[PDB]
Amino acid sequence: DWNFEKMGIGGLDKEFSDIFRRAFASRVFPPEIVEQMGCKHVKGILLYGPPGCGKTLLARQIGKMLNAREPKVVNGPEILNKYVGESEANIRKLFADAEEEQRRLGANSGLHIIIFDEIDAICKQRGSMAGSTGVHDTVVNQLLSKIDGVEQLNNILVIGMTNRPDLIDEALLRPGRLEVKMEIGLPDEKGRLQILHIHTARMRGHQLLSADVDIKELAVETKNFSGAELEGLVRAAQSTAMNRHIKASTKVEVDMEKAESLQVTRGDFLASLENDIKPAFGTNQEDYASYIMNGIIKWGDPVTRVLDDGELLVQQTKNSDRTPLVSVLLEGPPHSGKTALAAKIAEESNFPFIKICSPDKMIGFSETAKCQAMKKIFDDAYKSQLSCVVVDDIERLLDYVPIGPRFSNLVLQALLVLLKKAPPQGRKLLIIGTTSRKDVLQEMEMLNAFSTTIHVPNIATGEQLLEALELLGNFKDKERTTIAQQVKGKKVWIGIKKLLMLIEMSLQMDPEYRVRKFLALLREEGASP
């Protein structure tokens, strides 16, 4: 009486199809045909992937769809023992029933499932610690020689789950051993829709969900959410809906007159989205609120030019297929607004994955740690269908100082090698980078890695300065008419950030002594274009 819809797993149709085809296809065919071919049966499955995407659920459900014995579960390193020669005995005790029922009933026996949990804790590579740790070199040998040894077995099945598939032994993965290797990754929109339908079916059967909650909006608005995060979102919404009736001001009392009209409204979902759940392979509105601190104001023509060029680059990386990796360099003088524009360009791409690699969070690290951090971020960026990454203030990321000069070579080589490494086939990546010293980067032969360059200019006319002041709105009426008289008859060379600082510094004087000090500050800074 097995029915797929009863399993309750969404977003994994193809993986289950392949598992069924390879593992349970030669056990559900008439015996005569399976015997004439003369084929043995598969003896393992391995499951690996990031945390939270639904591995243990699949094993648990595979354990209930078989009219077989009760599966044996091993919880992590549950077999180690302190005495000599007890761990191997614990490992040998698992196959005893299989060996006994194979030696009597012949070719009519039934499966004996076995489930290893976190297999990478007791099955690491051999000869890795000068004969291993003493007990990690006999456990592995015993397991190898009991899964597939001189005595033959044909009625077992082993399932393994792991998070780090690189530390497992190599001899344990050959096609005569754990053979079917799958990967459980993030779902796409049509996977999120199925997950939400699975986790919201029960509520919508007893009329506890208010007509007004539309699931398409939730599916669209949650990008790169795992299954666990969607479940947590639904649970938080339900908790918020429940808590309205309960009162804990003085003593807990559950109202029983309003409890008959419980209904989960969309406001609960929005609040839970805003405040409670934070994804891990997505983006939030905090990095942008931390970097674009004062918005963006159009004080002239170039500002629109930069954004249009960025949009063209984004469109090219999204559409084309010959070049799956494009990069660009924004450069200009100091105090000019380079990081704000990069963040603005990135945020308006609607790519699912967006990160910002900055030196603010690597204070005091050596160069090895910097290499590791960069590598980890770029490793995370390779597991999505579209990625954008930003490298900020390069000259601080190499420890450059004019004297000598001095700098780090390992980080420079890592950067130079990481701008030419295309992603796994079918995925696309964009890299932006900001710097304030182009000639130095040129001297290191680092302007060939980048594909294109953009220039961020200063304020260089009186009209633009007056327009910026008008947009900010600090000096008004007669005051403006004074500045227009004084500044138009000359040239200026000043950045936007320094302009904000100068205005703020000037606004601290007396009401009748502001314009004069502002002009003094503007003149003293010096242009020297």
Binding site: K82, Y83, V84, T133, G134, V135
Partner: protein, 37 residues
Amino acid sequence: ASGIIMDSSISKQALSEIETRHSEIIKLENSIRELHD
């Protein structure tokens, strides 16, 4: 911090107390068999 060690064990036959002496009850049964005869 080196650690993670093992050990070996031995035993001892502590039930040295004899039991054969109290199991030679046959002669009493022989005497009572003679009585019944």
